[PDB]
Structure formats: structure tokens, C-alpha cells
Write a structure and sequence with these properties.
There is one protein chain. The protein is built from 6 helices and 6 strands. The protein has 171 residues and is α/β, with parallel strands linked by helices. It has one domain: Rossmann fold. The protein has helices at residues 12-16, 29-37, 53-61, 90-97, 110-123, 134-143; strands at 2-7, 47-49, 67-68, 128-132, 155-159, 163-168. The chain has a 6-stranded mixed β-sheet with strand order 3-2-4-1-5-6. Strand 5 and strand 6 form a beta hairpin. Bound molecules: chloride ion (3 copies). One chloride ion (CL) is lined by residues 161-162. One chloride ion (CL) is lined by residues 1-2, 127.
Length: 171
């Protein structure tokens, strides 16, 4: 089934290289600009969005009025929230690079995160635009056997759960 996934515009922690999960940070001005650029580029489909500020504000600026769902949130990094990528212990770095066996103290395991996400996608009964986070888009792209890193404010359309349709980036 056709689905459009949107990664929210950038926040400060993106340029700072800090893990951003359930920490509810706002986007930067550039993030807001990235969200506006999406207007007129996404299809007119029912919209759903993470309840975190940066996501639904991206939804708003993109010209949508999405229903909110916590299930579309980024992974909960637990004690690793706000942690600089550079300083992460090898085990966490590798876990995130290889996207496997990630168990952050006080947070969500990558396994639990994927089940939440894939379970939400399975519940969808019709094509829709999903305003979410980098880790969610990444989970979906990798599961479809592809590189999961896309630019903030960019989008991807897939035919879940068979293949990737298009990657839309607006410079
Ligand atoms: Cl379809
Ligand atoms: Cl895991
Ligand atoms: Cl299938």
C-alpha cells in the first residue's frame, strides 16, 4: 500500500550531533523553511503525525492537519537522550550504525521501536502521508533493503511492505 513518510525539519541537536528521541525540542528557522518547502509537493492524502512538536509543526507548515499518534515518534533513547554521537560508547555507536541490538538504559530497544512502527503501518487502511522522524523513516527504508538516511525535511514514498517508490529532497 502506498505510503509517504516525512522526516521533520532540523532542530539544533541535528547540527550539534546529539541523539534526539522523545526530548521535545522545536525546529530551527531552517527547519521551518524545510517544512514549508514540502507544501505543494506531497500528495493530498489523510495525514498522521508524531505528537512531538517538531513533527506536527512540520505537518502544519507543509499544509496538513494530521491526527496525532505517539506510535510515529522517534525511538526513545533513554539515558542517551541528548548524548553527543561522538562520545557514545562503541557498543551504542555500532548498534545504531548497524541498526541492531540497541538496548539503551531507561529507553526503547530497537526491537521494541520497530514493532511499534511496523505495527502502526500495518494498521493503516489506506494511503497516507506520515509526518515522523529520522529513525522511523530509516527503519522503513532498511526493512525494504535500502539505505535509511534521508535529509531533514525530505520525504519518501514506499509501497509497504514491498518496495521504495521515490525519495524526494528539496534543496
Ligand atoms: Cl496503494
Ligand atoms: Cl534491539
Ligand atoms: Cl507483500
Amino acid at each position: 500500500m502506498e505510503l509517504w513518510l516525512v522526516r521533520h525539519g532540523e532542530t539544533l541537536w541535528n547540527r550539534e550531533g546529539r541523539l534526539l528521541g522523545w526530548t521535545d525540542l522545536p525546529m530551527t528557522a531552517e527547519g521551518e523553511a524545510q517544512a514549508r518547502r514540502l507544501k505543494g509537493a506531497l500528495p493530498s492524502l489523510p495525514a498522521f503525525s508524531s505528537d512531538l512538536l517538531r513533527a506536527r509543526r512540520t505537518a502544519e507548515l507543509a499544509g496538513f492537519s494530521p491526527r496525532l499518534y505517539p506510535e510515529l515518534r522517534e525511538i526513545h533513547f533513554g539515558a542517551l537522550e541528548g548524548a553527543l554521537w561522538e562520545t557514545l560508547d562503541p557498543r551504542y555507536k555500532e548498534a545504531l550504525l548497524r541498526f541492531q541490538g540497541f538496548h539503551p538504559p531507561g529507553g526503547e530497544s530497537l526491537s521494541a521501536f520497530q514493532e511499534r512502527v511496523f505495527r502502526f503501518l500495518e494498521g493503516l487502511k489506506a494511503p497516507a502521508v506520515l509526518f515522523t522522524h529520522g529513525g522511523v523513516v530509516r527503519a522503513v527504508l532498511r526493512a525494504l533493503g535500502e539505505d535509511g538516511l534521508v535529509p531533514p525535511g525530505s520525504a519518501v514514498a514506499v509501497d509497504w511492505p514491498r518496495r521504495v517508490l521515490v525519495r524526494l529532497a528539496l534543496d
